[PDB]
Ligand binder design. Structure first.
Ligand SMILES: *Cc1cc2c(cc1C)nc1c(=O)[nH]c(=O)nc-1n2C[C@H](O)[C@H](O)[C@H](O)COP(=O)(O)OP(=O)(O)OC[C@H]1O[C@@H](n2cnc3c(N)ncnc32)[C@H](O)[C@@H]1O
Ligand SMILES: *Cc1cc2c(cc1C)nc1c(=O)[nH]c(=O)nc-1n2C[C@H](O)[C@H](O)[C@H](O)COP(=O)(O)OP(=O)(O)OC[C@H]1O[C@@H](n2cnc3c(N)ncnc32)[C@H](O)[C@@H]1O
Ligand SMILES: C/C=C/c1ccc(O)c(OC)c1
Ligand SMILES: C/C=C/c1ccc(O)c(OC)c1
Lengths: 550, 550
């Protein structure tokens, strides 16, 4: 297909057309769409960033290809080398507010690993793990579980929504909410297609499965994995798996994820914190409850305007234009029966044990006047708790998609710095974010996700994507928070395409010794800069910093 | 000094003699020793392999060098890059049975990082971590904790002795036995002198500490870390930390290890399994208890002789010269009130929790005939339990050093296959290890140690170093052991100087993709291969494989 909307760098129109011809040849014209439209969460766009803060046709693909299998991805890559055509690998492209399936480099070949590469490849009950291809969602897998009666032997671990790729997410080092909440950490045995074309699997994945008659002459892609590939991550020698998450080192095609066995008892809960400044003493309570394994999962500390947005848009609470006042938020609390901060957690295992954690935790949160403890049953039926009951046992919902609609034309954008598990420090980060949010005229909407020693601060910027003034006011908001938080010793853990460069430029100890060392290894494995140039600030030698950096 | 027994390759006497003169002018004479003796554990040697299977002077330094600071380390890397001089950094060189201090490539400059770089830079009671330089033995840290009263707040995680470098062990991916027994996975934020000699700090350690007066003008080494540096492993971008374990990618100057807080209750236990065959059912029982979290640490399953040999050498049991027979093992067992296998574990936390777990466990092991339960107090003054009851609470000890003296000239080498947590697999490996020890006319000594989903199975080969026929026999054993276990889908997780190239060739999936990838990265980062060429089987392009491997 002839004249495209944006071409990749240095490439003539003639060369685009010969390139696509061989791709159309290899994949069949079903699995190639040249771009010469915004959609929804349910039929996700693979051309552009749906929750856009820049121009809509800023981060935009030139084509989209859907490899049917692993050798298609070798062919396509071997090809992209031949021309020097940037690629952008996506699994499901539901990386929304992080840019979705937009390419950082306008003119790229967004690579739809997900549309066809689809298989739940294995579920191992005694190993308590599973192998996933990029197309398997959280829901896909969940529906694999229930169709096989495995729901009663192994539980999953899920983000706020079920659309996401199991692997795409894990590679992004993302976060769920059971004891198995640290997604990346739960990986074992990765299969990666390298920039050069050569296939790789890491860990004991490199320890070959012993030869047998039934497996002879099977393509590397389709071979089985040795018995320990997915039980020990490290294998032998340097442990490279992590070079491949939040990186442009490769294209991931298979990934082992560990699964938590049915604990033998479950109960979720909600403790409500009446005042705004109850954050500080809360976190101070969570601190040695987390560190001492009285809090087994990854709990959340939701802000009121987060649940408020799930149960109904802004307009149905106030007709005001500025962000809502402190007294107005108080009303919304007593309205919905929530506090200013809500702490959502869950207990796991046999009744004898849940009993004691609960008595400890209740008993710990008693030094806060006005507190209140809820099990799911005790709430409204629309309730967030009633949904999150499901999220903390590995049952994927979509309910939470709604908070995106806090403002006319729904679009989000994340700022996720990292703070200490101290009440003091948590307050500080909230006061620094809150301040810059009013200056920008937004509301503050957020959650802290409690890791053992660290805390993920998710600043949920919603804006209406057809207000040309506010989208710039967000652009200014975003650039200031990164800076402000750096000035204060916090950095983001993940970002949107437009802010990769800054955020990485944030981590500049000893004159960017981290980036310079990364740039080194990139140029070594990808001599031609074709795998996802730009990702996480990391530019190859043939993308000039000046022309490219944002 | 003028004349060492061995020169590093392609290096002249006159060059060597400049390098040395040059080296001496930096670090003073007291800190530099040419070599023109096996030492102890109490004062480890730094030139060669103390428990040496190969020739006594097969792995040999040409000199030792102790930098008084990171700037020295830097200065040295500088010279070595000029002269193309192999380095071989050790922290403490206690790596016996993996080669102690000995350098993969003879003629290397052993960098004794520990002698002067020593300090415990930090114990952070909120963070439940600590920050350690290459010289901080376990024991050293232990005594530090004591002299600052922290013993009733933060506990350590020790491996079977106390000499070990807190960090040297960590970047070997070593293993101890509290619930924080996965040492490598407890690191957050490491510092590193790269091969080029540029200084790098990883993870959050890349986000610098914000400017204030009191730190202005400090050399990069002596700059503090930013707040989240040792609480969140990951930073932002591609996670490179792993690159620096069991690899030769950098020289490590500092590291942050998580410390586990006093858990508010502690009980250890011995479970004796009376039959050789009980291992099989025994592991099956472990599988669900491990994975459902009833077992909180790295319990281990020790072969009986282990305890035998801690208690008194081979002679003290029979003047027999060949391996002791099955029946003598039944004899010895009963003699010491032990089983044919031995399970050691611990209970952490309040009395109510301990209670419940310990019943779940008693009960589950009861299905094995003639099983018997002992607490510390229930056993004789000299017991292994009484020793491990210490080990399991982060207290360093050394009694276990005895087993090394099974034979006239004690020396141990290790073989370290990973294994499934399934009895049938476990027995398979036992069979195969055992048959082979039998054929080399050796006494089988092993443990498995219980990972979450895997088991580290440490075949403990011990032979007498002055016996050339035995030495040679042990070199046939290991090489056979690596091969057989590969042929049945089991890799070794860590090895000895003289088996590194072999073990790697074992992880050869898809025409060795793993090593080829790793050889690529290593040349990028170390053009003149001065850092530890050879480690883990990974070689620079100037070390021809034909010349160098084994
Ligand atoms: C708007 C939204 C997002 C969200 C969320 C709630 C809302 C309402 N809650 C989340 C949660 O609690 N936990 C979490 O981790 N993320 C949450 N999000 C963010 C996001 O939408 C989801 O996490 C989603 O699962 C991620 O998108 P997806 O799973 O569909 O993956 P992707 O679009 O392909 O993005 C991956 C990025 O990484 C690189 N990448 C991805 N896959 C590969 C493979 N196959 N090979 C090589 N590189 C890959 C890409 O460069 C891409 O940028
Ligand atoms: C014989 C013995 C050994 C032993 C054991 C019981 C007996 C009696 N029990 C162990 C166990 O419980 N768990 C475990 O992990 N190991 C056990 N061992 C083996 C050994 O004693 C320990 O592993 C010990 O901790 C290792 O010695 P050490 O800590 O001194 O390590 P090293 O000698 O200094 O060198 C080890 C390797 O590390 C790399 N290294 C070290 N420092 C650096 C720096 N800073 N920069 C870059 N690399 C570094 C080197 O490659 C070296 O090969
Ligand atoms: C809202 C949920 C969410 C969004 C983005 C993230 O990265 C995340 O991880 C802690 C959580
Ligand atoms: C027996 C003890 C032991 C020795 C060496 C090791 O590497 C190890 O780690 C599992 C354990």
């Amino acid at each position: 297909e002839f004249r495209p909307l944006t071409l990749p760098p240095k490439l003539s129109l003639s060369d685009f057309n010969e390139f696509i011809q061989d791709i159309i040849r290899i994949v069949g014209s079903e699995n190639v769409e040249v771009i010469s439209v915004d959609g929804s969460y349910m039929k996700p766009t693979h051309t552009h960033d749906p929750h856009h803060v820049m121009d809509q046709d800023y981060f935009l693909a030139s084509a989209i290809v859907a490899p049917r299998n692993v050798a298609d991805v070798q062919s396509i890559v071997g090809l992209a080398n031949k021309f020097s055509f940037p690629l952008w690998p996506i699994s499901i492209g539901r990386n929304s507010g992080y840019g979705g399936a937009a390419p950082r480099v306008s003119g790229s070949v967004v690579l739809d690993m997900g549309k066809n590469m689809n298989r739940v490849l294995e579920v191992n009950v005694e190993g308590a793990y599973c192998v996933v291809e990029p197309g398997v969602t959280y829901h896909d897998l969940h529906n694999y579980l229930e169709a096989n009666n495995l729901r009663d032997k192994l539980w999953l671990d899920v983000p706020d929504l079920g659309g996401g790729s199991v692997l795409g997410n894990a590679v992004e080092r993302g976060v769920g909410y059971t004891p198995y909440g640290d997604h990346w950490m739960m990986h074992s045995g990765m299969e990666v297609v390298l920039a050069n074309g050569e296939l790789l699997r890491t860990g004991m994945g490199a320890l070959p499965d012993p030869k047998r008659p039934e497996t002879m002459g099977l393509k590397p892609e389709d071979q089985p994995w040795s018995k320990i590939a997915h039980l020990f991550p490290y294998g032998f020698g340097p442990y490279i798996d992590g070079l491949f998450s939040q990186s442009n080192m490769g294209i991931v095609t298979k990934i082992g994820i560990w699964l938590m066995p049915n604990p033998r008892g479950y109960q979720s809960y909600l403790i409500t914190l009446p005042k705004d400044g109850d954050l500080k003493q809360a976190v101070d309570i969570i601190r040695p409850l987390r560190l001492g394994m009285a809090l087994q999962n990854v709990p959340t500390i939701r802000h009121i305007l987060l649940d408020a947005a799930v149960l109904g848009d802004k307009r149905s609470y106030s007709s005001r234009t500025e962000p809502l006042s402190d007294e107005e938020l108080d009303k919304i609390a007593k309205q919905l029966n929530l506090g200013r901060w809500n702490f959502y957690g869950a207990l796991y295992g046999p009744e004898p044990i849940r009993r004691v954690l609960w008595e400890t935790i209740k008993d710990a949160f008693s030094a806060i006047p006005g507190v209140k403890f809820y099990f799911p049953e005790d709430t409204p039926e629309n309730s967030v708790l009633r949904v999150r009951d499901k999220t903390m046992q590995g049952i994927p919902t979509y309910d939470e998609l709604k908070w995106i609609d806090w403002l006319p034309n729904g679009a989000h954008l994340f700022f996720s710095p990292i703070a200490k598990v101290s009440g003091e420090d948590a307050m500080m980060q909230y006061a620094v974010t809150k301040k810059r949010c009013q200056e920008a005229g937004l509301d503050f909407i957020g959650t802290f996700t409690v890791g053992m020693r660290e805390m993920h601060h998710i600043v949920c910027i919603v804006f209406n994507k057809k207000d040309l003034i506010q989208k710039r006011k967000v652009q200014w908001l975003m650039r200031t928070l990164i800076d402000d938080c750096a000035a204060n010793g916090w950095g983001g853990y993940r970002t949107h395409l437009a802010f990769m460069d800054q955020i990485m430029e944030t981590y500049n100890w000893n004159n960017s010794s981290f980036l310079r060392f990364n740039e080194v290894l990139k140029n070594a494995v990808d001599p031609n800069g074709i795998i996802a140039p730009g990702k996480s600030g990391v530019w190859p030698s043939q993308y000039s910093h000046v022309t490219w950096k944002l």
